[PDB]
């Protein structure tokens, strides 16, 4: 059953997620406004959304027990490689299968396939991301499971350029054993059915969405006209 250290990890991750994820979406009013008629009329708004989301993921990451005790260089490698994947994960909280959209509280901040295509992304790559969101939504994760999964995603010891892979793996294993034990102790059947295995498969799916995005980003931003519509932080994190 769940130890005090495993309960403590969870408590920490919940607190971290709560302070970095406003389920009212009030800050979106400060983004460049959405335009749904440039042709990339949604790129300013969704670039802001991403950049805001990178900030938040970094605030969550810094709270993961042991992350701040890694070297700065390894912290930076882990965040650069995982940032899009944790954006994808955390977005699941607004995603709704009613319409296959991300519903952030109002018609202006509801994002569908079309909106994302007006940010420069092919329907072919957008489709796998919607399918991912559906599969993840179907898991019906407890908040505890959601946050642990975001954390396991960030402290992955296989990301290219990691120097202290063992230290990263020691963290991740503590999160992972916390997750397994939580599903077994607190998640009732049958929702718990192979739930750990399914969650870990989502991380593998996210590697694929990452790789595909990486190439598309490299194309979009290679164009100075598009890069100019991004933010400083997005350029720094995803590259120039």
């Amino acid at each position: 059953k769940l130890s005090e250290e495993q309960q403590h990890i969870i408590a920490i991750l919940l607190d971290a997620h709560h302070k970095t994820y406003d389920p009212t979406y009030a800050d979106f009013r400060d983004f460049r406004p959405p335009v749904r008629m440039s042709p990339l009329s949604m790129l300013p708004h969704l670039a802001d959304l991403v950049s805001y989301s990178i900030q938040k993921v970094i605030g969550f990451a810094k709270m993961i027990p042991g992350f701040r005790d890694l070297t700065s260089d390894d912290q930076i490698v882990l965040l650069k490689s995982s940032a899009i994947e944790v954006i994808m994960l955390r977005s699941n909280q607004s995603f709704t299968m009613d319409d296959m959209s991300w519903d952030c509280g109002s018609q202006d901040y509801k994002y569908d396939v079309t909106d994302v295509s007006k940010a420069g992304h092919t329907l072919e790559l957008i489709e796998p991301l919607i399918k991912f969101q559906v599969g993840l939504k179907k898991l019906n994760l407890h908040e505890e499971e959601h946050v642990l999964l975001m954390a396991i995603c960030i402290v992955s010891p296989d990301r290219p350029g990691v120097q202290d892979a063992k230290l990263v793996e020691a963290i991740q294993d503590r999160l992972s054993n916390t997750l397994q034990t939580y599903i077994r102790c607190r998640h009732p059947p049958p929702g718990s059915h192979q739930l750990y295995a399914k969650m870990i498969q989502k991380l593998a799916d996210l590697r694929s969405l990452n790789e595909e995005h990486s190439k598309q980003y490299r194309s979009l931003s290679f164009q100075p006209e598009n890069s100019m519509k991004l933010t400083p932080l997005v350029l720094e994190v995803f590259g120039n």
């Binding site: 900030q55 970094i58 605030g59 810094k62 701040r68 700065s72 912290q75 930076i76 965040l79 650069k80 400083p232 932080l233 720094e236 994190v237």
Partner: peptide
Amino acid sequence: KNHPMLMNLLK
């Protein structure tokens, strides 16, 4: 190569 902003958000 440098990550001034990401560094600052980690500090």
